[PDB]
Every structure is written in structure tokens, then in C-alpha cells.
Amino acid sequence: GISRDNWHKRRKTGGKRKPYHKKRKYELGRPAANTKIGPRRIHTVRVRGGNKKYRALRLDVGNFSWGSECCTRKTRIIDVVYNASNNELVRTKTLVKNCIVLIDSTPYRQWYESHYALPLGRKKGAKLTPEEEEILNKKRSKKIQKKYDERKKNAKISSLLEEQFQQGKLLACIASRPGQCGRADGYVLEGKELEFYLRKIKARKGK
Amino acid sequence: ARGPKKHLKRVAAPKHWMLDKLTGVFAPRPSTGPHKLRECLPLIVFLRNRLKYALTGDEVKKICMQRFIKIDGKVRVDVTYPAGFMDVISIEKTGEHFRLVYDTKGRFAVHRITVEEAKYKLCKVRKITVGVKGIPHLVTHDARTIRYPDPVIKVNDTVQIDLGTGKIINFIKFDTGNLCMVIGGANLGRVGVITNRERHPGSFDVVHVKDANGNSFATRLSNIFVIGNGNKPWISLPRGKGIRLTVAEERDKRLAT
Amino acid sequence: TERAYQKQPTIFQNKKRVLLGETGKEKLPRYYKNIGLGFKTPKEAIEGTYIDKKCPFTGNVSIRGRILSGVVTKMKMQRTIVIRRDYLHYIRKYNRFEKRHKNMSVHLSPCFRDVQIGDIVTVGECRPLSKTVRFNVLKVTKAAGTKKQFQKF
RNA sequence: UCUCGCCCGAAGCGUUUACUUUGAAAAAAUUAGAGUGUUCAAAGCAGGCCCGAGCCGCCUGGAUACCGCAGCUAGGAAUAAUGGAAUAGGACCGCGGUUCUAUUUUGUUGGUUUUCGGAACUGAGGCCAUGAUUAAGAGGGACGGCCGGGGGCAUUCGUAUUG
RNA sequence: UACCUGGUUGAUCCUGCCAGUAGCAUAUGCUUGUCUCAAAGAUUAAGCCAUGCAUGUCUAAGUACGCACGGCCGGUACAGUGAAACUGCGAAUGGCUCAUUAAAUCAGUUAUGGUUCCUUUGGUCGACUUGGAUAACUGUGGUAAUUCUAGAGCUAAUACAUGCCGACGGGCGCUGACCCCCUUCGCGGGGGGGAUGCGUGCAUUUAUCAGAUCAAAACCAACCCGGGCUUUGGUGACUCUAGAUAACCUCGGGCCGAUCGCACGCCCCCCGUGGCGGCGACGACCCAUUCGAACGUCUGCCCUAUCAACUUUCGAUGGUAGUCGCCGUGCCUACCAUGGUGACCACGGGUGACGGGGAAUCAGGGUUCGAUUCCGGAGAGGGAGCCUGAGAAACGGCUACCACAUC
RNA sequence: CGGAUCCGUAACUUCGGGAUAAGGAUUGGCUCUAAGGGCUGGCAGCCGACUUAGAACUGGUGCGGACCAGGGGAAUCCGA
RNA sequence: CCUGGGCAGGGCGAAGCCAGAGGAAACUCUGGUGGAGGUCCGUAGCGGUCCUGACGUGCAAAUCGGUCGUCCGACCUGGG
Numbered sequence A: 001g002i003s004r005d006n007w008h009k010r011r012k013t014g015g016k017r018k019p020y021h022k023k024r025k026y027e028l029g030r031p032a033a034n035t036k037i038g039p040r041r042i043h044t045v046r047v048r049g050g051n052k053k054y055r056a057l058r059l060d061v062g063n064f065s066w067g068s069e070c071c072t073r074k075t076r077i078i079d080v081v082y083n084a085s086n087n088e089l090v091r092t093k094t095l096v097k098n099c100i101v102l103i104d105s106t107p108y109r110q111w112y113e114s115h116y117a118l119p120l121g122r123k124k125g126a127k128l129t130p131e132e133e134e135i136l137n138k139k140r141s142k143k144i145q146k147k148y149d150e151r152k153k154n155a156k157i158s159s160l161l162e163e164q165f166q167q168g169k170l171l172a173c174i175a176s177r178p179g180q181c182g183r184a185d186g187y188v189l190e191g192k193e194l195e196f197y198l199r200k201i202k203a204r205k206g207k
Numbered sequence B: 001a002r003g004p005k006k007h008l009k010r011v012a013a014p015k016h017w018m019l020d021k022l023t024g025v026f027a028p029r030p031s032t033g034p035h036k037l038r039e040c041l042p043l044i045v046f047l048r049n050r051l052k053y054a055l056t057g058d059e060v061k062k063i064c065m066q067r068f069i070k071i072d073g074k075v076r077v078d079v080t081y082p083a084g085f086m087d088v089i090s091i092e093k094t095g096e097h098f099r100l101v102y103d104t105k106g107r108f109a110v111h112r113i114t115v116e117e118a119k120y121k122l123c124k125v126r127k128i129t130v131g132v133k134g135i136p137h138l139v140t141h142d143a144r145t146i147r148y149p150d151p152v153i154k155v156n157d158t159v160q161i162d163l164g165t166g167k168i169i170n171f172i173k174f175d176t177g178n179l180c181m182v183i184g185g186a187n188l189g190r191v192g193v194i195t196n197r198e199r200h201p202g203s204f205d206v207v208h209v210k211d212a213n214g215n216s217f218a219t220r221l222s223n224i225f226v227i228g229n230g231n232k233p234w235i236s237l238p239r240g241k242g243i244r245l246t247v248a249e250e251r252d253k254r255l256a257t
Numbered sequence C: 001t002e003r004a005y006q007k008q009p010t011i012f013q014n015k016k017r018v019l020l021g022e023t024g025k026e027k028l029p030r031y032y033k034n035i036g037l038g039f040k041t042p043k044e045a046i047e048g049t050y051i052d053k054k055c056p057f058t059g060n061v062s063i064r065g066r067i068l069s070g071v072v073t074k075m076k077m078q079r080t081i082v083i084r085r086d087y088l089h090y091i092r093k094y095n096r097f098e099k100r101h102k103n104m105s106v107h108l109s110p111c112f113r114d115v116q117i118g119d120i121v122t123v124g125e126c127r128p129l130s131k132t133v134r135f136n137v138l139k140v141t142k143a144a145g146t147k148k149q150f151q152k153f
Numbered sequence D: 001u002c003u004c005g006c007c008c009g010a011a012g013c014g015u016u017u018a019c020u021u022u023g024a025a026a027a028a029a030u031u032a033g034a035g036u037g038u039u040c041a042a043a044g045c046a047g048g049c050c051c052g053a054g055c056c057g058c059c060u061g062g063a064u065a066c067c068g069c070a071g072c073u074a075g076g077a078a079u080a081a082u083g084g085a086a087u088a089g090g091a092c093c094g095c096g097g098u099u100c101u102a103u104u105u106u107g108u109u110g111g112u113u114u115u116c117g118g119a120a121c122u123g124a125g126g127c128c129a130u131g132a133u134u135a136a137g138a139g140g141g142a143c144g145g146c147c148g149g150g151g152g153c154a155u156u157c158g159u160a161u162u163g
Numbered sequence E: 001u002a003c004c005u006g007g008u009u010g011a012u013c014c015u016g017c018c019a020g021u022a023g024c025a026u027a028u029g030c031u032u033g034u035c036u037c038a039a040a041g042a043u044u045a046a047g048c049c050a051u052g053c054a055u056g057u058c059u060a061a062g063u064a065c066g067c068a069c070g071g072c073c074g075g076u077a078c079a080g081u082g083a084a085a086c087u088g089c090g091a092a093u094g095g096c097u098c099a100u101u102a103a104a105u106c107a108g109u110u111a112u113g114g115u116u117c118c119u120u121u122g123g124u125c126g127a128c129u130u131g132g133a134u135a136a137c138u139g140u141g142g143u144a145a146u147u148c149u150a151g152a153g154c155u156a157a158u159a160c161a162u163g164c165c166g167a168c169g170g171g172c173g174c175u176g177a178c179c180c181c182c183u184u185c186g187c188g189g190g191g192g193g194g195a196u197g198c199g200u201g202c203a204u205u206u207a208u209c210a211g212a213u214c215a216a217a218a219c220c221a222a223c224c225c226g227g228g229c230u231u232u233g234g235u236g237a238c239u240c241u242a243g244a245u246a247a248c249c250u251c252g253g254g255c256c257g258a259u260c261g262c263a264c265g266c267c268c269c270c271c272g273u274g275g276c277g278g279c280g281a282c283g284a285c286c287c288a289u290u291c292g293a294a295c296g297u298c299u300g301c302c303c304u305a306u307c308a309a310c311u312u313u314c315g316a317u318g319g320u321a322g323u324c325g326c327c328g329u330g331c332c333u334a335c336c337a338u339g340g341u342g343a344c345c346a347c348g349g350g351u352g353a354c355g356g357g358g359a360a361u362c363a364g365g366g367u368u369c370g371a372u373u374c375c376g377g378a379g380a381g382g383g384a385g386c387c388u389g390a391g392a393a394a395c396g397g398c399u400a401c402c403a404c405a406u407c
Numbered sequence F: 001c002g003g004a005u006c007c008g009u010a011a012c013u014u015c016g017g018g019a020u021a022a023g024g025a026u027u028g029g030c031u032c033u034a035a036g037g038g039c040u041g042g043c044a045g046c047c048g049a050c051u052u053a054g055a056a057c058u059g060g061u062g063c064g065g066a067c068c069a070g071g072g073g074a075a076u077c078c079g080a
Numbered sequence G: 001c002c003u004g005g006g007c008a009g010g011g012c013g014a015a016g017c018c019a020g021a022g023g024a025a026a027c028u029c030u031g032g033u034g035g036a037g038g039u040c041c042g043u044a045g046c047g048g049u050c051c052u053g054a055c056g057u058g059c060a061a062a063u064c065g066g067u068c069g070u071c072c073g074a075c076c077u078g079g080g
């Protein structure tokens, strides 16, 4: 019964428009589904033209793209911080189009080891994690190729992303609509946007 | 109204179908096809009303499903199948190969053609695009979507199409000096050489054309069909070159009889 | 700077230029749209700083349809101004005209600085931006008097 | 302008409305109006010639005119308004310098530099017939010999009336 | 037919109105022979309806063991007609009426590059046949009846579902044991090959990279030849289309034929136990066209000032993000700014107001109607919500309220 | 009825009033969110104030929970 | 008459002043500030409307309990 219509509105001046329609079919309104952080649960919605819409009532998985290095892996959604449109949905933990998700930083560590060897995030222990870190021994000139990847390109992921990898959480921005396509797809906050949202979260925790 | 329309009135019918006011209430609504309702001509109008092959429409409905009348090579089962400009109509028993060219007054002038030209067909390119795996597609106003056409086809060109295989050949471009035929507006059926195009940034460009014995007119790009190459039409057009002389010259021709 | 929550239309920021450590310039990743139509893009959209979603030279707002002209009346509405279009209406009975005008609101792009009240502005049709805004400011033509003059303080 | 093939296409193209002349512009019916002996006519979109039935037939119409007002295009420059150059921050041509980049030849790639193409800024000089239509039997203002029971304030005089 | 006449006065002239004059379309009175057309419960009551109808549908081509008719008819399912059902399509059309509605609806003109789209038209379509369920049908019933239905048995498929083979693996990305050449005593540097393992195609949802107008050299290091070489299209405009890069592709799961009919021939082989199958019906992921729908731009509408300020806590105007929606949107939400309209008549009322193309009225100019056969809108007593469906807030669909109203 | 907050308030008039007019909604507990400042260095950092508004959850509709505390309206006569 | 003492808190929001908007002018509209008054609800104080309540050989030869009018003043009150 929700009408997104525009015939119940005032004019340029503010004169009340007289009603004569009966809230027709081509001006539907469906209720909002606040996408929680629980398990995966998606219902269906019939759309005019026979189309199908995927309403995500609650989600656990996500697909988030790393910015600079162009990598994208699976992600468990952890926590909802700083909606920046309505602060009630931060406490409600509702996934919207422009929101911030804490990526569990585990599925990027395997790619960073596999392409950007001598990795980080080992809290300067240098004795743990028998990973196969030093087993394949890097026989041929692809060792030299990884040396070009590691020291000539120099792999600078400067200290903001260093501290986020040490904490194990990665601040990311959603880029898709969770209530429309049923997907919490997004990208990783990088650089100036990263420090801007970090400053906003720090000031919100401060005041 | 709710959904699409379903009937058509004789009064709301277009003028170029030569329909009556006393014969019936409803007009034959053409089915969906390659041509819009204002620029098409149904088979029941082509048979019952124009050529006078059957008096009633039920006989036309019987013969079009008794598989006599075919359009562009294949048989159409619909009595109200749309057939617009430049469509080859042949029925299988005698020499009857009709071309749906436009009369000078705007009607559908009949034109019986020899089989060696009835095998072929011209058609105007509507647009050109690229599709899956980087292949070129061409959309025709005859609702022909063909792949791998050619690289040197402008959007407003005219390409000869084969009816037996669906193969394109003999593209002619929109150039100053090509014989065109106007297919819409107030000057439809006008045959003339393209003289001067004038472009405009408002997504619609105008074209002044000239024809023989010193006459010139103007039209728009949505109503231009290139038919020839320098006073050499690829399709023979009936009743002279298809020229509107003057109403007074028409009266003088009727007095000369 | 910015006084909102996020301003980044299309251009990806981080090239990760740091191979030995340098700051450099950051005004190079800027989106630059040509509107066509034979109308010159101003240099404020070239060496500017603003980020606008509804800008005809920065945002995805396409210019189509009609092109009209008016005179600017007010500035008090945020990032969009109200213009006035005086015209005459022919009347068949009395066989002469009368003045009519319809005030329209139009999205003033922030690249068009020095947009003082009284200047003849060119507007173009676009998609519906808001409830009463449909046009978009395209080119400011007239200086609306002598800008050469200067008063005390 | 000769940037793309001694002239032209082409692009810079319009200071912009008001007004006119074209041209597209729309959907029919209706209105004026073409043809037609529906027995004339209101209508209708029909019908007409040859053939003793035997030409397994031919020919033609079903147009045009209006469609204001609003919108689009191409010509017209009289009529009515609008800014150009007044504290010159103007107009052309020719000069000095700073920063930057798209792509081509040095056989190719990688690093450096210039001419070139242009945007951005800046200094001097030459050049214009260098730039302001004169002041309406329009108006505002100024000067000065007046003029008026014009207005305000203060003063002065005159009988008469009453006591 | 560019038209008047009588009436104030004892009489005359003038302003002035009244009354005659003539169409038009409603009613009514009197009268009426032929014939061609011909509007016709609009005005008050968009008030109430008894009764009868107005939406059904089968091809050689979806499913036929009906107990119905019967081909010659023997048997290795099915000759054919085939009532009734299951399935798909349409019932969102047509007809009726003008009650609401005064920049609202409509009319002229422009675009969706800001969306969807039944059907048709073309492209794309790269396990010798599986599983339950059920109607019609047979017997058994209930009530006062309805287009009411239960429980027992049965069977079907293009209703539902599940799911296999082909097809060589082409080519590419990342790791990749090992191998060749040149130099150095080895260490070391450069160039060139090479199986396993993860991926792979179109769409969905992300993020990134490369993507056209412009020609002449000079220094330093590596390598090919005999001083010398390399590329999608369109718009006036793209965040358009098209490529490459890493992953999801969502159990309410995009596609990649477990379908039917006609004509019946051909080839190899040890047998056909294998192929060669020509044409037609179904939508099937997507792309365009077509029937449209939808919100958009400008301009245009009757009277009233005894309607001069209106709108804004229950968005009024704009911005920032988000939600919903088919998408562009104060359509909705949180924050921020205080806006927006009006004497060029907004706002507030009435219309015996659906808007036009049109109709009547004979100089020109105008005036008054247009419910009415065409187009577009609105509603099916008032008014709200919704399944199905591509398309409805549908009413010869449903659900609940009010006023009626049948057994 | 009574306090407080948010709406909305007539006849009449000396235009001041009438008015706390009339008539409605909320009021508890517990978590939060936003806003309202000072002091140092040439925008960054340390320290406290009880106020307002909004949201969720919950208790047997219970919330001025005791106490504190205007029933109201239409009129007539007289005295301002 | 002289000389001293005292009157808790809230409501209404006058003059004056500031800012914004309109108008050619006269001036008008809106949002604040301000705290005026023989002003309102109300305590102490001062009087005593009603229950014609209690008492009524009483606490009292005039008192008590509620309900009361007014409480910045034409206010209450000590001493000379």
C-alpha cells in the first residue's frame, strides 16, 4: 500500500493538489528490509515485466575488491561502523549501498604471500607459522621475478594498511545495493578516503 | 488504458489504406512486425481492398492459411500481417511479383516485377552496433539483425538483401548525388536526387532534394530511403519517375486522357 | 575542501606512485567531460577543486532536449538558482500582446563564479534533478553592466 | 582560415529577442473544394470504355486548402528595446620570457633535451582620423530683474457692537 | 442575403430599454400520404435492479485405457471421430457514463543516453529417455441451497521436478621439476623452451587497466635483418557499445530441448543392433524492431478580491548520502541550509467543468455550447488493500468496512 | 480537571484582554545518539556543566503512580 | 506624624533596543532582547466566604478543621 507517487504533493507555490487517482499499480512501494549481519538469507520479489529481485534479509558473505593491487577475494562481514546517512543504522547494523564493513583480513594474506613473498603480520616473532614460507626454495629465475615484484615495485602498502593488517580488520566501502541484488559487493578504502573515514570514526569515538 | 490496444477504428485508421465509412466500424489492425502501424499495409487490405481477389475477408483468411500468399520468400499465416515499404509479394502460381512502392499521392502503388529482380530486395540500415565477442551487428528497418555485415556501412545507408539466403550485397551510402525516395511526411513518395544536407545539433538534420524538370523539396533524415546511384534507380519505379507535377497539370492530363 | 561525507565521482585515486617517496601533485586525477553542442567547457572545471554530482561538466547529467535563456533573480537556494523568462503572448481577439513570465529554478554549477544578479544565462534540458529543477545552467553570456567600475571599499 | 581536397566545399556561426517570407509539422473524421448522372439532391467513394456470351479484359480516382497560438530550419534588416570604447582592464598585426603535454622521425625499447601544436601567466613599443551623435517649440537643475489677497510666526492700526 | 419596425410627447429630435424578426436544440399542442437517411433515459437520480444474455478456445503438430461412435482385424502400445478433464493463451479487450478533476486532464512540440514490455519479425541458441504428485473416472457422502467440497483407488504430460553424453581440449593468466646458449675457476648476470595444479563461455553484481588526428632530431645501455616495422565502431555529448584483469553468480537457484507431427528415402558394415534426417508448432538467457505504457521540457484553460498574502512540526524549497521503485526524482528516511510562489492575480472558493478535433450563429471581428459515435483521461454504489498475470490496485476478480439488498 | 511538554483556541471588546478559554496526545524504567564550553602552542592537544531533542528495548496501559493541585461552558441583574 | 523590620517560587510579556524582509515614501511584517504592573496561580503574613461543620456549663465571656479573598502593595507590623 506504499505509494511513491507524486500526485499527493503541493505545487511550485504550495497549493494542495486535489486527489483523483487510487494509488495505482505502476507506482509500487515495498517495505525496507534491514540487512543484518547474521547467516545468509535471501527472499525473492516479483518485479513488473516478470523480473526477479533478490531481497537480502541478512548476510554473512561479501565480495570486496582491493583497490591498488586489483585483487578480490571472499570476505566474512564482521561489523557495521559509520553509515554516514543515518546513525541509527549503525546500531541496527544494516547493510546499505554506501556503508563501511570490517573485512576479516585473512583471505588477502594468502594472496599477499603467494605474489608478494616475505610477508607481514607476524608481530615480529620470526619463529612461528610453518606455512611453507621457506619450503619451495624459489629455484629458477622466477625468484628474480619475485625480487622485481618485491623490491623494485617495493610493495608499499603504507602504515595505515599496515596497522589494519596487524589489527586484523580492514575498513571497506560497499559499492552495491544489498536490498536490490542481494549482494554486499564493495571495495577497500584506500589512501585519502581511508584516512578521512578513519578520522571520522576516531572523532565519533572521541565525542 | 490498461495494457496494449487491441482494436482499430475505421475513422482512426490512416488515410492511405483507402478504407470506407459505410462498409464497417472496425478497421483491420495490423499485427506486430517490422513496420509501425502508420507506415505499413496489411495483407487483407492488399488482397480484399486493393487487388480485388476476394470480396469478403473470410476468403482472404482462408487462403492465407491455405498457404498461397508468401512475403519475402516464406509463407505468412496471418491475414493482418504488416507489409510496409519495399516488400516483395509473390503468390506461387502466375507472374505476380508486387513491390510496395509509394504512389505520388501517398498510396501504395502496385508494381509487378520480373523474377530476376523479384529475387532481390533493397533495405535501409536503421543502425549499426557491436555485440558478443566483438562482432558487428546491423539493424534494418525491415527488422533484420544481421551479423558480420561490412566495415564501411554508415548508419544511413541502403543495402541490397537477398531473399533466398539473407546475404547482403551492394551497399550505397548517403552522399550528395544519390537518388532517394521520401517515405514519410507531407512529401511521401517524392523521388529526387539528394542535393544538400544540413546538420543540426538537435539530433535531427534536414535534407533538400531536387529532381527532374526543375523542382526541389525538403525532408528529414527519418523519411529518406536511398533508391539509386546518380539518376540510376536500382528498382524500376512505376508510372514514370514518381513525380508530383501540379494539380492543374493532373487536370490537364485528365482532359488529355 | 569538502563539507560532506564523501565526494569521489568516478576517477580512482591511488596510483601508488611511491617508488622512492614523493608527494607530487594530486589535481591530475580529475574527471573532464565534454558536453558537445558546440559550447566551450570553462577552465574552472579544468583547474577547479569542486566535486559536484549534478554538474554538467563533472557529473553524469546529460544535456538534451531544449535550450532556453533567462535572467537570474535569486541566489539564496543552495547550488541552484531561480531564473525569470519574460515573454509575450499573442491574443487572437484583441490582436495584441501581453507580458507573461514563469519563474523556473535551475541548477547553478559552482564552476560558474561571478554569477551576479541580472545576467543573461543559457539553460539546457536534462533529466529531473529534483522536484522543481529540470534545467541546468550551461553558459553565462552577459556581464549585466560594467564590471570595470569600483566604489569605495 | 587554407587547418581537411587563381575559385569552391568545409569549419570558425551568429549581439539576441520582437516582426515578416519559405520549408518541414500533425490524425483521421468535420469545414471550403477536384471528379462522379446515388433517378436530381442530402450522401456515397465510387466508377468508365471495348466485347452479338468468346478482350481466359483494359483505364482512372479515392486530391488539394485551413490546421490558429506554442516549438524547429533557411532568407529579409525598415519598424521598437538591448551592450560594445569613458577612471580604457578596449581593436588588429608584429615581439621578450616562465611552467606543461598528446604523438612522429633518430632500426626497436628504456632515461635526458629542443623545434613543433596549444592552453595558462607576464614586460615594452609602434599602430586606430585612437574611442563620448549636438542638446527636442521634451524634461530636471543653476543664475537674476521681478511678481503674486500663495503659506507660517511675531507685531501694528481701524471704526462699529456689547457692558 | 454588411438590413430593421411599434411604444415616453399637444407635436418634434436624442440617449435609452421593452416588444416584435430569423436560425439553432430540448420539451409540448394540432395534424399526417410516399420514400432515402436518421439522433434517441445526457440534463433531475454516477439512484435501485427482478428476469435472459454479453468470453470462450483443438490443430497431421501438448496430455486420450470415458463406460460414447466404430475401422476389419490380426496382434509386436498407439487406425480415426473423440464427450469430460490436465495444460497454454485471453477475459488488463470491446461496450457504457462523465461523478471527481481548473497547469490537474487534454492539445501542439520535443526524449528516455533516466526504464519495462505479451505477441510478431531476425540473430544467438557449442541418456536407446529419470522421479514422485494429480484431475477427468469408479464406488461412498454431508447439509437448505451456491460455479460447495472432503475422504478411498487409479493413471497421464510442454502441469511440477531431477538430471546425463558429445568435444578436440584449441588458446590465455599464475606457479612449475627440468633443459639450451653467452661470459666468469666457481659465485653471479642476460636471452629462449618446458607436464602436472587452479581457472575457463553469454548474463547477473563488483573493482581496476588500455582505448584517434600532429612531424623533425641529438646523447647513454640492451637486440633483428640487409641503413632500415604494426591498428574495434557510434552519437553534437557518455559513467555508450566492445576487450583484458581477481572472485560471487545468491536453495524463493538466469540460459546451455529428458517435447510433438508429416513425407519416408540413402550409405558403410558381420548383423543395423550405426549414421546421412528435409520441413513445421512451443517459449528458452539476451540483443534490437513492433503494440504500447510511464514519468519528463516549453506554451495554451471559465468565473470570483465580499479569496492579498500562501506553503513549511504531518516536506515547504534545495544540498549531502541512503531506502523503495522498472529506472531520474523530497517518492520516503537521517543531517544541514531557509528557502519556494505572488498585483504579469499565485494561494482560497464555485462551475448547472471531462479536455480537444468540432457544432450553432451568414461582412469582418466576435458570442455561446462540445455528456454524446474519433483521440486521451477517470470510475464501475462510496472508498481502502491484494493474489495471479508481461500488462490491474481489475470489479461480467478477490478480501474487510458503510449504505442497500436475495434465500 | 489539576503538574509539565507538543498542538489548537470562540462569542465579545476600551484591541490591552477574554485565556492555564474550550478540546486532544505523551509522561515509568534501562541502554544509546546529536547539540549547547573553558584552558595551552604558530589547526593540534587536556578538563568538567546539567539542560534540550531524537531512537531502540521492556514492564499485566503502568507511569504528576505518594505528596504538591484551576471542573468547565452559555447567560441575566448590580457594582467599572 | 516620627523612627525601624518584612513579603518563597512560577504565568502574562509594556515602553525602549537589535537583526532580517518588503516599500519610492509613509511606514509595515517577522524573530529575538527587555522586565513594566494599585497584574495573575500561590507560601509566610493580614482578614474571615461557606460547611450556617466541631465546640457551644467549650481550649476560648468568639476558639478550632477543611474550603477560603489578597499577597509589591490604597500591603503587614514593633517602639515613641
Ligand SMILES: [Mg+2]
Pocket: A205, A206, A207
Ligand atoms: Mg562515548
Ligand SMILES: [Mg+2]
Pocket: B001
Ligand atoms: Mg476501453
Ligand SMILES: [Mg+2]
Pocket: none
Ligand atoms: Mg427580444
Ligand SMILES: [Mg+2]
Pocket: E315
Ligand atoms: Mg520529515
Ligand SMILES: [Mg+2]
Pocket: E353
Ligand atoms: Mg461535473
Ligand SMILES: [Mg+2]
Pocket: E361, E362
Ligand atoms: Mg457564422
Ligand SMILES: [Mg+2]
Pocket: E366
Ligand atoms: Mg465569426
Ligand SMILES: [Mg+2]
Pocket: none
Ligand atoms: Mg496521461
Ligand SMILES: [Mg+2]
Pocket: none
Ligand atoms: Mg478502472
Ligand SMILES: [Mg+2]
Pocket: none
Ligand atoms: Mg447504479
Ligand SMILES: [Mg+2]
Pocket: none
Ligand atoms: Mg470490464
Ligand SMILES: [Mg+2]
Pocket: F011
Ligand atoms: Mg457563541
Ligand SMILES: [Mg+2]
Pocket: F018, F021
Ligand atoms: Mg472566560
Ligand SMILES: [Mg+2]
Pocket: none
Ligand atoms: Mg438588559
Ligand SMILES: [Mg+2]
Pocket: F079
Ligand atoms: Mg467592587
Ligand SMILES: [Mg+2]
Pocket: G039
Ligand atoms: Mg495585584
